[PDB]
Amino acid sequence: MIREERLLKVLRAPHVSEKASTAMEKSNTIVLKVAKDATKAEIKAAVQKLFEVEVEVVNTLVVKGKVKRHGQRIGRRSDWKKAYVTLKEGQNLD
Amino acid sequence: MKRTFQPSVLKRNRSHGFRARMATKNGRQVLARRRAKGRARLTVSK
Amino acid sequence: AVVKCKPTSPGRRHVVKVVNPELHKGKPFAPLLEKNSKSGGRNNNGRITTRHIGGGHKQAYRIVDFKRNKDGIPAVVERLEYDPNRSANIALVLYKDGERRYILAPKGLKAGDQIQSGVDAAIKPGNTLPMRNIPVGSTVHNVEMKPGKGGQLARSAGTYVQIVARDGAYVTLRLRSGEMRKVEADCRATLGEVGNAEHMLRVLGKAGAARWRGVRPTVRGTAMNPVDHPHGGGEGRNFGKHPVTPWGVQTKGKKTRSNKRTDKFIVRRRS
RNA sequence: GCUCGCCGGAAGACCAAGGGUUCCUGUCCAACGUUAAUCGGGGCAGGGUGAGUCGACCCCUAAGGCGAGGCCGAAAGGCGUAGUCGAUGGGAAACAGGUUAAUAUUCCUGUACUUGGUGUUACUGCGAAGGGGGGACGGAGAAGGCUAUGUUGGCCGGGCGACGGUUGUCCCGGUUUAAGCGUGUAGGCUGGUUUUCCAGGCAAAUCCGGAAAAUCAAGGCUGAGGCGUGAUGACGAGGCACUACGGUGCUGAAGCAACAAAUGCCCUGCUUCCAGGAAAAGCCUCUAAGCAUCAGGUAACAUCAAAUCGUACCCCAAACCGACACAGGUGGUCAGGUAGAGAAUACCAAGGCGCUUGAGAGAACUCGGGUGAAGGAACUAGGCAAAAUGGUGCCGUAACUUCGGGAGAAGGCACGCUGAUAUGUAGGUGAGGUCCCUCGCGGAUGGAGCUGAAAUCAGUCGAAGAUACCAGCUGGCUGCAACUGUUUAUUAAAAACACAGCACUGUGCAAACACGAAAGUGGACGUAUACGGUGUGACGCCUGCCCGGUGCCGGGAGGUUAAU
RNA sequence: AGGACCGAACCGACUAAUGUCGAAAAAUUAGCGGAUGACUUGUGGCUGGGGGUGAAAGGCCAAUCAAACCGGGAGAUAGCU
Ligand SMILES: [Mg+2]
Ligand SMILES: [Mg+2]
Ligand SMILES: [Mg+2]
Ligand SMILES: [Mg+2]
Ligand SMILES: [Mg+2]
Ligand SMILES: [Mg+2]
Ligand SMILES: [Mg+2]
Ligand SMILES: [Mg+2]
Ligand SMILES: [Mg+2]
Ligand SMILES: [Mg+2]
Ligand SMILES: [Mg+2]
Ligand SMILES: [Mg+2]
Ligand SMILES: [Mg+2]
Ligand SMILES: [Mg+2]
Ligand SMILES: [Mg+2]
Ligand SMILES: [Mg+2]
Ligand SMILES: [Mg+2]
Ligand SMILES: [Mg+2]
Ligand SMILES: [Mg+2]
Ligand SMILES: [Mg+2]
Ligand SMILES: [Mg+2]
Ligand SMILES: [Mg+2]
Ligand SMILES: [Mg+2]
Ligand SMILES: [Mg+2]
Ligand SMILES: [Mg+2]
Ligand SMILES: [Mg+2]
Ligand SMILES: [Mg+2]
Ligand SMILES: [Mg+2]
Ligand SMILES: [Mg+2]
Ligand SMILES: [Mg+2]
Ligand SMILES: [Mg+2]
Ligand SMILES: [Mg+2]
Ligand SMILES: [Mg+2]
Ligand SMILES: [Mg+2]
Ligand SMILES: [Mg+2]
Ligand SMILES: [Mg+2]
Ligand SMILES: [Mg+2]
Ligand SMILES: [Mg+2]
Ligand SMILES: [Mg+2]
Ligand SMILES: [Mg+2]
Ligand SMILES: [Mg+2]
Ligand SMILES: [Mg+2]
Ligand SMILES: [Mg+2]
Ligand SMILES: [Mg+2]
Ligand SMILES: [Mg+2]
Ligand SMILES: [Mg+2]
Ligand SMILES: [Mg+2]
Ligand SMILES: [Mg+2]
Ligand SMILES: [Mg+2]
Ligand SMILES: [Mg+2]
Ligand SMILES: [Mg+2]
Ligand SMILES: [Mg+2]
Ligand SMILES: [Mg+2]
Ligand SMILES: [Mg+2]
Ligand SMILES: [Mg+2]
Ligand SMILES: [Mg+2]
Ligand SMILES: [Mg+2]
Ligand SMILES: [Mg+2]
Ligand SMILES: [Mg+2]
Ligand SMILES: [Mg+2]
Ligand SMILES: [Mg+2]
Ligand SMILES: [Mg+2]
Ligand SMILES: [Mg+2]
Ligand SMILES: [Mg+2]
Ligand SMILES: [Mg+2]
Ligand SMILES: [Mg+2]
Ligand SMILES: [Mg+2]
Ligand SMILES: [Mg+2]
């Protein structure tokens, strides 16, 4: 099974946006920015064992990184994996 | 007018790609020369 | 049968087709087909060795049984079939025991004859049996050079070689080109001439015919430039040199046969 | 925001290739944009790419690459067997509707579907790097059957008119509905089932192939569309509540027929032609050694699983290739109306743009055009350019000819519109009704409705009726090349090159010959009716004399002559 | 049936003018040729420098071609400017 170490390493942070808020309010789906190599089963098992929720299924994607210009210098701030964790009905959470 | 460069990454990474350079011995010399020159973009492969 | 064409349009005025009405219109017996990939005159180096080869319509290779080891088992020729690889028509024959095989088509065969192979077989066009049992003086085709190697002498469209004499372990063959060659007297032969005897009466008509058959054009020598062909060059028409091949050897008369390994088997070269 | 103009087989709507954030909101305009810019593909910040079903990975192979050993090569290395890679190809499954400032066959709703693993019961012999079938295939042509789609009538809703008329055969808008499941038709291919054996399928086989016997005469494979269900649901003209004066919120009528109809589907069909038209796995099937209360196979139900990567945006372009926001280049797919043979062309619909400098004046001169008195090539190197001709039907049509041609030769003549034939015809399509029935997605009748040429006759308007756009200039003599073709990317398209044909010649197969120190390859899985080389260049009539010179071929007496 | 015929897409490049510090290091416009084939096109392979390829022009081989490009011998040599 998934060990607790990896289970904890999976999730990085929640997400804050207008799409994030409208999703969590309407379709009962949270959004989590997660470590770039964590899979669907890992994300689902981790949100379950960590938030005491029942999750339906996770839709995940990799937002592509942006190129920024500091002075004359060009750089690539990362890409990262953004997961739409669609909770099961009736579940509330802090 | 059909200009000369008609890009395609399959053909590019097959003809000049890193492993196509590392296959032969002469390509190994190409890599040695570029490494000793200090190139940042070593091969054409990303 | 040879048939002209009505001059409906230039390029059709000078063509003559060769048609056969009991041939097979359909698909060839599949288990005897293998894929055939055209090389266009290029060897495994990638360079062009024999010029004038390329293009041409796709073909599949009909497997043909030239060795003919099916001894004593009588077969019936199920049908005659067009063959794209070669100039003689093939014949799908079905043996008594249910195995099918392609063979070359002797002349006197058509839908429904019987063949027997091996030293037992009777002497009829199509049967095959070694030239230690063929009567002396007969005409055969598909003659092997070594015992059991495979049909090599005269398997073309209108050819046949005559067993002129047998003196010991070697029989003298008057070959189609006119040689007299001593072939080992245990080589297989198959009686009678080959089938498509009118393949030399056809004409191609339009360059399109050669291009369909896969023969690229040929740019002759007094048109090239001196860097390309030894003949090439000259303001206007100039040809003041003895004809040579593009690699600088004689081409009008110079003999080339140098295989001293078999000069003992050539009884008499042709004239 | 209203008018105007341009695109509309594109300058519209989706992608691949390729870029890489150009996408969306907020703020800013110093630079960038050929001008100002409050605007932007510019600067900064925030957001945005959601998949069992799409694509990739994956399974499978082509050309080809690499290639254990191997063979070969001063070394580097070259080729290649077993293998292993390589999609531009073959292989499981999803659609409709809604929704975001930006994503959707991915989210939401509704209804599905395939393939494994696992479980519980019922019967069963399963079993492969092996055998067999399948997958599995060309060009052209021909209709038939349909559909997408379109036109009209009907129905439903709204209208009844800025200026003469418009409750009527009047006007505008709508009339939509998928996968799946079920029935499973038009068409296409094939005669079925059983028994007995056989040297074939490198072993076996109950499979395939072969040979004989009975045997009923039909079964089966396949298949678009239609019709049910999906769906008393979604959608739906509009009305009304709401305004952040963005567009939101809430209900919601009709939702059918007839006809025309693809370049799409049946159709990887059918006919015919030669130029004779990939492979491999998935799939079905057979067993071998082997395991044989088990394991495994099949069916049923429940169950788990479907990972990973791409998904924004542009994509005939301001984002791609061209140094540029460049009059260039770039593969696939979608295909409305009227006129027309048509994807031409003119005008339009949806949809998108007015091309990132303007405002005046209305000289010469240049550019792109319009028209022209009288003459009509007098211009000129030369009718260069321009002008002209131009369509369908019929009439007629010379020399020459290889008997196909020449030929659309040339030359004319008719063409609009309205009525009548005929309240729209011949035609195509075909309901209702009736009849038989192996009752159906059937057949014979039957003709309403619908669609609808072309012609004749009468009238009529204009200067002109193929009115625009579109759309051969024609004829006579002759050179050269037979011809369609190919060529100097970027000053030469020709009489040059090629060509079918012709002839000479080499080559007997471990072929000549080419590539390569060599192995090995091409020639060719061909074999003298074959291949290589060289000249000539369809066809018709032809092809004369010269072997001294040079090459080639043959000959060996003699002379000369190397290494040894 | 056809290297048949007319003609759009697609492919080409005959003539003319414009352009020739161009809109463009070869294009535009008005005409023009082929348009079921010796056709055209996408993807991916293969052939290489005295070598490839060439329906043959000494053309083409990354805007370079009677011997490519790059690096080196190399500061070649220059009785010439
Ligand atoms: Mg761990
Ligand atoms: Mg989901
Ligand atoms: Mg190679
Ligand atoms: Mg051949
Ligand atoms: Mg020839
Ligand atoms: Mg050359
Ligand atoms: Mg020479
Ligand atoms: Mg000259
Ligand atoms: Mg001369
Ligand atoms: Mg010589
Ligand atoms: Mg149209
Ligand atoms: Mg567009
Ligand atoms: Mg891309
Ligand atoms: Mg760029
Ligand atoms: Mg930026
Ligand atoms: Mg500015
Ligand atoms: Mg500029
Ligand atoms: Mg911006
Ligand atoms: Mg789903
Ligand atoms: Mg190799
Ligand atoms: Mg593979
Ligand atoms: Mg949708
Ligand atoms: Mg079995
Ligand atoms: Mg098999
Ligand atoms: Mg009403
Ligand atoms: Mg009024
Ligand atoms: Mg109406
Ligand atoms: Mg409609
Ligand atoms: Mg079904
Ligand atoms: Mg057997
Ligand atoms: Mg049987
Ligand atoms: Mg099409
Ligand atoms: Mg056993
Ligand atoms: Mg079991
Ligand atoms: Mg969009
Ligand atoms: Mg442009
Ligand atoms: Mg650009
Ligand atoms: Mg269409
Ligand atoms: Mg318009
Ligand atoms: Mg509009
Ligand atoms: Mg003026
Ligand atoms: Mg006037
Ligand atoms: Mg004028
Ligand atoms: Mg005048
Ligand atoms: Mg006049
Ligand atoms: Mg006149
Ligand atoms: Mg002119
Ligand atoms: Mg004109
Ligand atoms: Mg006319
Ligand atoms: Mg005359
Ligand atoms: Mg005549
Ligand atoms: Mg004439
Ligand atoms: Mg006429
Ligand atoms: Mg009219
Ligand atoms: Mg009339
Ligand atoms: Mg008139
Ligand atoms: Mg004369
Ligand atoms: Mg022509
Ligand atoms: Mg071979
Ligand atoms: Mg001699
Ligand atoms: Mg033609
Ligand atoms: Mg050009
Ligand atoms: Mg033009
Ligand atoms: Mg044209
Ligand atoms: Mg070399
Ligand atoms: Mg360049
Ligand atoms: Mg110097
Ligand atoms: Mg030196």
**Residue C217's CATH number:** 4.10.950.10
Which tokens sit at B26? 């002469």
> Which 147-176 residues of chain C approach strand D with CB closer than 7 Å?
149-150, 152-159, 175-176
Domains and CATH numbers, chain A: 2-94 (3.30.70.330)
Q: Are C15 and C9 in contact (CB under 8 A)?
A: no
Whether C218 and C243 map to the same domain: the answer is: yes
* DSSP E strands, chain A: 11-14, 29-34, 55-63, 67-70, 73-76, 80-87
Q: How was this structure determined?
A: cryo-EM
Whether C69 and C95 map to the same domain: the answer is: yes
Report d(CA B35, CA B1) in Å as an integer: 38
Please provide the distance, in angstroms rounded to a whole number, between the alpha carbons at the two ends of chain A: 27
Whether C214 and C239 map to the same domain: the answer is: yes
For residue C92, give every residue at least 6 positions away whose Cβ sits within 8 Å of its Cβ, in sequence order, or none. Answer: C24, C28, C29, C32, C77, C78, C79, C80, C81, C100, C101, C102
Burial class (CB in 10 A: 0-12, 13-18, 19+), C2: exposed
Which ligand is located closest to the Cα atom of residue B3? 66
Give the CATH number for residue B45: 1.10.287.3980
The dihedral built from the CA positions of residue A45, A50, A54 and A59, taken in this order, carries a sign that is negative
Report d(CA C232, CA C222) in Å as an integer: 5
Which tokens sit at C111? 């839908």
- Find the domain containing B43 and state its range: 1-46
Ligand 60 centroid to Cα of residue C240, in Å, is 23
Ligand 10 centroid to Cα of residue C259, in Å, is 23
Q: How many Å does it take to go from CA A26 to C1' D250?
A: 20
- For C85, half-sphere exposure in the C-beta direction (CA atoms, 13 angstrom radius) is 15
Please provide the distance, in angstroms rounded to a whole number, between the alpha carbons at the two ends of chain C: 32
Q: Are A58 and A44 in contact (CB under 8 A)?
A: yes
Which tokens sit at C7? 């001059």
Report d(CA B43, CA B13) in Å as an integer: 10
Whether C91 and C165 map to the same domain: the answer is: no
Whether C203 and C264 map to the same domain: the answer is: yes
Beta strands at C2-4 and C16-18: parallel, antiparallel or unpaired: antiparallel
Query: Among candidates A61, A66, A63, A64, which has minimal Cα distance to A76?
Result: A66
Ligand 7 centroid to Cα of residue A16, in Å, is 81
Q: How many Å does it take to go from CA B7 to C1' D17?
A: 8
For residue C89, give every residue at least 6 positions away whose Cβ sits within 8 Å of its Cβ, in sequence order, or none. Answer: C20, C23, C80, C81, C82, C83, C105, C195, C196
Q: Contacts from A65-73 at CB under 8 Å and sequence distance 24+?
A: none
Last residue of a domain, one of C133, C160, C194: C194
Report d(CA A29, CA A23) in Å as an integer: 6
Q: Is A37 helix (H, G, I), strand (E, B) or coil?
A: coil
C1'-nearest nucleotide to the CA of C8: D404
Query: Among candidates C212, C216, C218, which has minimal Cα distance to C59?
Result: C212
Q: Are A51 and A93 in contact (CB under 8 A)?
A: yes
Last residue of a domain, one of C62, C90, C113: C113
Whether C144 and C167 map to the same domain: the answer is: yes
Which ligand is located closest to the Cα atom of residue A86? 2
Angle at C252 between CA C249 and CA C255, to 5 degrees: 70
Q: Are C246 and C229 in contact (CB under 8 A)?
A: yes
Report d(CA C204, CA C217) in Å as an integer: 14
Last residue of a domain, one of C113, C135, C167: C113
Whether C100 and C4 map to the same domain: the answer is: yes
Q: How many Å does it take to go from CA C105 to C1' D240?
A: 91
Whether C86 and C130 map to the same domain: the answer is: no
Task: Give, in order, the Cα–Cα distances in Å from C93 to each of A45, C62, C107, C142.
Answer: 69, 13, 15, 17
- For C232, list phi and psi in degrees, rounded to 5: -65, 150
Nucleotides in D strand less than 7 A from protein CB? 17-21, 43-52, 62-66, 76-77, 79-80, 87, 100-102, 106-108, 132-134, 136, 198-201, 209-211, 273-279, 306-311, 320-322, 328-330, 402-404, 482-484, 489, 496-501, 504-516, 520-539, 550-554
Which tokens sit at A64? 């592509």
Whether C62 and C151 map to the same domain: the answer is: no
Domain count along chain C: 3
The region, left, alpha or beta by phi > 0 then psi within -120 to 50, assigned to residue C7 is: beta
Tell me the helix, strand and coil percentages in chain A, rounded to 5. 30, 35, 35
Q: What is the side-by-side order of every strand in the sheet holding C100-104? A: C100-104, C90-95, C75-81, C114-115
Q: Are C169 and C183 in contact (CB under 8 A)?
A: no
Report d(CA C170, CA B37) in Å as an integer: 74
Q: Is B27 helix (H, G, I), strand (E, B) or coil?
A: helix
Give the CATH number for residue C27: 2.40.50.140
Residues forming a β-bridge with C130: none
Whether C229 and C174 map to the same domain: the answer is: no
Whether C4 and C50 map to the same domain: the answer is: yes
Q: How many Å does it take to go from CA A44 to C1' D149?
A: 49
Resolution, expressed in angstroms to one decimal:
3.4
Whether C208 and C247 map to the same domain: the answer is: yes
The region, left, alpha or beta by phi > 0 then psi within -120 to 50, assigned to residue A26 is: alpha
- Find the domain containing C153 and state its range: 117-194
Domain count along chain B: 1
Please provide the distance, in angstroms rounded to a whole number, between the alpha carbons at the two ends of chain B: 30
- DSSP conformation class of C118: S
